[PDB]
Amino acid sequence: VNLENKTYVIMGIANKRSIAFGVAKVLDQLGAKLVFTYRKERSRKELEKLLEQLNQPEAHLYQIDVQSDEEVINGFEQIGKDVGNIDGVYHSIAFANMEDLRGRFSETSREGFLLAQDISSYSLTIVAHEAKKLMPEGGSIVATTYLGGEFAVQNYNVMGVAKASLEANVKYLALDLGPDNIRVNAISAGPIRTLSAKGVGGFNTILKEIEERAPLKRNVDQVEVGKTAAYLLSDLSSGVTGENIHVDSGFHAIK
Amino acid sequence: VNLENKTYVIMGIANKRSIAFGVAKVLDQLGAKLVFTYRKERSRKELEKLLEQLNQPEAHLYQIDVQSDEEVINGFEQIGKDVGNIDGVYHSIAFANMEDLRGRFSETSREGFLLAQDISSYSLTIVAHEAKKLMPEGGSIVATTYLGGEFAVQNYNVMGVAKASLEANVKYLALDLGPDNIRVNAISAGPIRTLSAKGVGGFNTILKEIEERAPLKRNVDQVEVGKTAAYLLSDLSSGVTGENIHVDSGFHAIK
Amino acid sequence: NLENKTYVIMGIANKRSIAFGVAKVLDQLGAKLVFTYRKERSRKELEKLLEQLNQPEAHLYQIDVQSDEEVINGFEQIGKDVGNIDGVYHSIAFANMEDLRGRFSETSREGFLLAQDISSYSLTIVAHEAKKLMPEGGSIVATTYLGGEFAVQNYNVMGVAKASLEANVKYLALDLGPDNIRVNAISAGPIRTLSAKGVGGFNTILKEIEERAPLKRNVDQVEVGKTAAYLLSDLSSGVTGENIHVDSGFHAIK
Amino acid sequence: VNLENKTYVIMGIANKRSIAFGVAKVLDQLGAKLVFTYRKERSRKELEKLLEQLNQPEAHLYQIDVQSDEEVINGFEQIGKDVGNIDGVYHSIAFANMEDLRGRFSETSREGFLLAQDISSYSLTIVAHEAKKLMPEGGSIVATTYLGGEFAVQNYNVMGVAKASLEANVKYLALDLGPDNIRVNAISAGPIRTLSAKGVGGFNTILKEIEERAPLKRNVDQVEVGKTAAYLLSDLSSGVTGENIHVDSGFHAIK
């Protein structure tokens, strides 16, 4: 593309291995102004250190726990006060407990099921609503999903149902904001070594299955997700909404 | 398909228009012993009255609000004490607040979003968990979904996202409970005038458009969901699990 | 219960045909069965297989679906010999052996069109002809494989023919629905049939299903026929343009 | 997405309105070298006049009728001799007789059905086989489909079954050629006023409905298909294969 004079909000960089950091690098390289949101003080610390590798002349950092309507509302409001209107949001946030992930799915607790939904799916809805106010002439919103939202994948358990929820959330949001010229899409990333990935049982062996079985016979990386993100966040993908692009070496397409 | 010496639990008859009552008439007509569960007082009364149409020699009625683990745990425990091992469960339960079935999806409240997940999806997981205890030999579990879980349908809003979640729940339950010989499937019913259908904006429209546009050129009814449920709840459908069967006059197949 | 129901069953070759699984189940449910075979060999064979069933008579018709006239005259005769029918079970497909292994991208025009012709287009002509014999509606069921939905190694040109057959179903459903003819697919798991010898690495798939499918076991022709009973009968009123996976749950997992 | 020192074969321009000339304008814009294939001498004459609006310094025009193995085989071979190694093929080719694009699908002739399959689906397979010869390094093949491939759309009839075939063709080519680093994907375009769209009953109606019912509330144009083509044919889409991107204002996602 080329993304000068554009401003994107990126949510969910924890460290250098975060998918959303792959997005950040690509967008930053393409001329975009970036604004970053985080939950833990530690993620902010990592952000401050990761910005040195970037071209951003300014640190634009905001603490937003997507569990709190107040923090999302006040965050996006302060972002508009600081940078003005924006062109899109990359959503890269999910959560579930260990204790429910390494259960039989049937043994999942209600509080863990809903926690997963709340952070991993609902949060897009409220982010979309608040971000929309900073997009008076339209823009783009991308969330990150995984194929365990379309099929039942051993171990992914509660997070699979939260992804199914997220992928519909995208479709309903696309229907709703469409007339506002806001596009909403999902990237279905293949497995990537991240901090959150350490929490999913059997991650390593799925990695390996991908190399053996996927059409491109290899795994993907954060920058690949970031390149597809730039497509979805740019004018290149006008006409595309409610879509789910698999960035996964073609693994979605086989059995 | 003869069901004598089978026992099924049917969840979510409110009145004679309920989908689950379509299911009950079919199962009863085929010789099954039936247990029913309800939430409201008013629903148990309706059930008491509706039983006079059935061949069920006794009434097995249980109050189970699926918002409560204790009620589901204790309910299914009582069922096992009163009737013994069962052969399957029909789940016909969902809820969302009125203002979440119309206007704009992007303005869905967090509590409204999570409420719909809890009742309309999570409840399957917990029901399957407890119903399993009564199926040492294997059995069958069916839940009721709608096309709006697969596609954004105007006005179906927060329920669309809960049916997406429910549909994934079915897949993950099938994967989990499969080795125990417990099948888990969905019926995706077409629009049908029920009490809950009154909370969905634009329902009359969707009905007409089915008559005009679906293959069979006519809407379905509860008995037709019922005969598909009989198939899934019986040995006719051994080998079928994690499936979603559209009983919607072919509407799912066109565009 | 299918008493005074009459169904045409296409593609029995031997005791292991999926269509024989369907036959036994329908026969068991009291239905009258007409069979269609392709070459005289399957005739002496079929004749022997029906000594198992409860059919009082052999209604047996050679139809190679590569010929319009054999499909046209075939159904025309069935109507004269037996009267109106209640549905059709399609259990028919073909591809040349060299196209069912190695490299899809190396498939010949002729071998690709052959597969389309027999495995997909034949449904359309069968439906048009069979419709003439179901004035009050009826039910048509074809057999597919998950390979028409996902690319499955080795299945190759047959996967593109099945994808074709699954859309044919959709389109037959839309077109024939106002006549009350329902059209559906059963997507069967793998089963040791005569024709599955020709698919590369079929034994490797058989074992994957056992290891990985929700039911942790494979399916048989009888389970396929039980689901065909549902689809061919009134139990499945309301359901058309559908593809039901009788596959120990394999389609739902990745 | 800068495409200098890239070369793409664009198959199936007939006039200023062709979807493939959308692609061409876009790829040309981004600095690619372009090679055109046509069938009818009139499509060459049209290409020659449209070349004047491109920045291409030379005309590279081949006559390939994809019904001929020999013509595909010799066309591509020749292309290799003339411009050397290519980066991708954009396939924008389909055909069906007018009878079989209206009225009753069940009345499709054998001959019409195979003719649609041959031109509209099989051609991709042989084009990929021959084009693989000019991509020893890897590359990108994109074919043009329509939602009629995934659902029954009234009137689309024999072509929809041909587009199903094509979409599956894309999936199998992606499995087969992934190990050679050749990505194969499909763009599912919304309805667009072209020469070949004049053959399809009820085309005007579908246009109007997309406007009323699709999330963006507008039709897409050829240039929007080109912008997404540029993405699929470039490194921006490096982890994407066996995929189908709907450039259709959202329509695919709604029911």
Ligand SMILES: NC(=O)c1ccc[n+]([C@@H]2O[C@H](COP(=O)([O-])OP(=O)(O)OC[C@H]3O[C@@H](n4cnc5c(N)ncnc54)[C@H](OP(=O)(O)O)[C@@H]3O)[C@@H](O)[C@H]2O)c1
């Ligand atoms: N890695 C993969 O294999 C893979 C594959 C497909 C899809 N995905 C999806 O990709 C996205 C990014 O995950 P990742 O793999 O990049 O892992 P990650 O680096 O661990 O990032 C996850 C992010 O989620 C944020 N988060 C969790 N709860 C939050 C909350 N309540 N409020 C605000 N932020 C919250 C974390 O912030 P804090 O650390 O500050 O708490 C962290 O930045 C997730 O949606 C994941 O499900 C990942």
Ligand SMILES: NC(=O)c1ccc[n+]([C@@H]2O[C@H](COP(=O)([O-])OP(=O)(O)OC[C@H]3O[C@@H](n4cnc5c(N)ncnc54)[C@H](OP(=O)(O)O)[C@@H]3O)[C@@H](O)[C@H]2O)c1
């Ligand atoms: N009608 C349609 O067009 C349609 C189409 C597709 C799918 N569906 C689905 O079919 C199922 C049955 O709905 P329906 O149309 O038959 O409407 P219905 O008659 O209103 O039944 C809904 C039932 O859900 C029960 N329920 C709600 N919350 C509950 C809770 N917390 N605990 C226990 N029970 C609870 C209700 O019980 P109480 O009244 O006692 O509170 C009522 O029995 C639902 O899953 C619905 O989403 C309906």
Ligand SMILES: NC(=O)c1ccc[n+]([C@@H]2O[C@H](COP(=O)([O-])OP(=O)(O)OC[C@H]3O[C@@H](n4cnc5c(N)ncnc54)[C@H](OP(=O)(O)O)[C@@H]3O)[C@@H](O)[C@H]2O)c1
């Ligand atoms: N077995 C599996 O794992 C599997 C799984 C999923 C789907 N299927 C499908 O199930 C169906 C039945 O196959 P099967 O596995 O049961 O194998 P089968 O016993 O070999 O039956 C296949 C039948 O197709 C008939 N046939 C082929 N071309 C014909 C033509 N041109 N005209 C008339 N009949 C023709 C064969 O006839 P002749 O012997 O007379 O040549 C044979 O009766 C096929 O559609 C197959 O694609 C099979």
Ligand SMILES: NC(=O)c1ccc[n+]([C@@H]2O[C@H](COP(=O)([O-])OP(=O)(O)OC[C@H]3O[C@@H](n4cnc5c(N)ncnc54)[C@H](OP(=O)(O)O)[C@@H]3O)[C@@H](O)[C@H]2O)c1
């Ligand atoms: N327009 C739409 O709404 C729409 C929507 C989605 C997808 N599509 C698809 O987009 C692609 C391009 O179509 P279009 O709408 O842009 O129509 P178009 O401008 O009429 O182009 C169709 C092209 O197909 C070529 N063609 C037909 N048979 C051929 C053969 N045997 N060998 C070589 N070329 C052949 C034609 O070449 P000649 O004129 O020289 O014969 C023509 O250039 C097709 O796959 C179509 O199915 C169209």
Ligand SMILES: CCCCCCc1ccc(Oc2ccccc2C#N)c(O)c1
């Ligand atoms: C067997 C599983 C296959 C590998 C899964 C690939 C994958 C890895 C990490 C993911 O991220 C999370 C996972 C669980 C809980 C929170 C997050 C977060 N954030 C994800 O969504 C998907």
Ligand SMILES: CCCCCCc1ccc(Oc2ccccc2C#N)c(O)c1
């Ligand atoms: C967009 C209009 C399409 C017509 C929708 C068909 C339909 C009607 C009623 C349904 O039931 C509920 C709906 C909302 C809340 C609770 C329940 C319950 N129980 C349902 O799930 C689907």
Ligand SMILES: CCCCCCc1ccc(Oc2ccccc2C#N)c(O)c1
């Ligand atoms: C790697 C794939 C695993 C096994 C696939 C299961 C399968 C077995 C047999 C099939 O039948 C045919 C196959 C080829 C040609 C004709 C027929 C016929 N008739 C089929 O369609 C699918």
Ligand SMILES: CCCCCCc1ccc(Oc2ccccc2C#N)c(O)c1
């Ligand atoms: C029911 C109307 C649906 C709207 C149609 C969208 C559409 C328009 C034109 C298309 O192109 C062809 C159509 C038929 C035959 C050849 C070609 C070619 N080339 C296409 O594939 C799809």
Ligand SMILES: N[C@@H](CCC(=O)O)C(=O)O
């Ligand atoms: N993370 C480990 C532990 C999972 C478990 O034992 O449940 C794995 O790859 O499975």
Ligand SMILES: N[C@@H](CCC(=O)O)C(=O)O
């Ligand atoms: N149930 C009425 C009211 C809709 C509304 O305005 O919310 C309908 O949509 O026809």
Ligand SMILES: N[C@@H](CCC(=O)O)C(=O)O
């Ligand atoms: N072009 C006409 C076709 C006319 C017909 O098939 O009757 C239409 O828009 O349908």
